[PDB]
């Protein structure tokens, strides 16, 4: 499910550390 989570975060422009 990390697949969808990462996509959603990408879609929102969230900053990854």
């Amino acid at each position: 499910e990390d697949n969808i989570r990462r996509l959603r975060a990408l879609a929102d422009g969230v900053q990854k550390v």
Partner: antibody, heavy 121, light 108 residues
Framework: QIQLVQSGPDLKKPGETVKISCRTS????????VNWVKQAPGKGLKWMGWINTNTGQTTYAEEFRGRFAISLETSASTAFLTISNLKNEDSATYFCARLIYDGDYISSDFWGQGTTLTVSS | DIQMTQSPDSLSASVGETVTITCGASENIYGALNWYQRKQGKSPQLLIY???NLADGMSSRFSGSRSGRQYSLKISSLHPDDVATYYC?????????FGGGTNLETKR
């Protein structure tokens, strides 16, 4: 130590504008998001919006899209919440929190102490 | 927008007892769920992230689980300092909406 220090409490008249500040320290400001949470008296937490501290991109919950603006002063590691045309319903305590995303999960891991706004004649 | 339904509104339990708070997501949120603890007069504190992961510096007496669209916060053994309001939060897609919150009190 990681800290988010907000500006003090304020009393405003309806129709006026308030700018609440969130001064951060203890980490690389532009590697983490900042998001704002509203808590009206006797009500729960309400997520208001987020700003990308790197790109400046913002996103708001529907309820707050109009009169609410999140902005930055990057050189001072500070974020601001500006509320325009204040209404009595805006009386609440506002929190800023650091938004961290570790590549798997997203959360508000560090919080400011809160800012209590009263709107009144 | 995702709507979070938290249950129950308030909860009372004896010390040492196990307590369970639940959250229902209006849609599948793929395990992206946070729990925050709000002690009286303090700022919310991250308690659980990713549905099941204990946040730094929080008691191991707290754990989280998931069943479909039902998320659970569990306290294995209640202590008096656990009294607080607990909030779940959608953390998948913005807006990261909170549940209505749950007031936890102690029976003594």
């Amino acid at each position: 130590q990681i800290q988010l220090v907000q500006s003090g409490p304020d009393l405003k008249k309806p129709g006026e504008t308030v700018k609440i500040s969130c001064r951060t320290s203890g980490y690389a400001f532009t590697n983490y998001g900042v998001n704002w949470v509203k808590q009206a008296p006797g009500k729960g937490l309400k997520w208001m919006g987020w700003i990308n501290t790197n790109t400046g991109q913002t996103t708001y919950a529907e309820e707050f899209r109009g009169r609410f603006a999140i902005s930055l002063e990057t050189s001072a590691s500070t974020a601001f919440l500006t509320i325009s045309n204040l209404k009595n319903e805006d009386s609440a305590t506002y929190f800023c929190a650091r938004l961290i995303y570790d590549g798997d999960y997203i959360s508000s891991d560090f919080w400011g102490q809160g800012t209590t706004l009263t709107v009144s004649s | 927008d995702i709507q979070m339904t938290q249950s129950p509104d308030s909860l009372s339990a004896s010390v040492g007892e196990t307590v369970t708070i639940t959250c229902g997501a209006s849609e599948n949120i793929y395990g992206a769920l946070n729990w925050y603890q709000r002690k009286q007069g303090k700022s919310p504190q991250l308690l659980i992230y990713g549905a099941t992961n204990l946040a730094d510096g929080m008691s191991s007496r707290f754990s989280g689980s998931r069943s479909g669209r039902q998320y659970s916060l569990k306290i294995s053994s209640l202590h008096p300092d656990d009294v607080a309001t607990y909030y779940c939060q959608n953390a998948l897609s913005m807006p990261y909406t909170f549940g209505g919150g749950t007031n936890l009190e102690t029976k003594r």
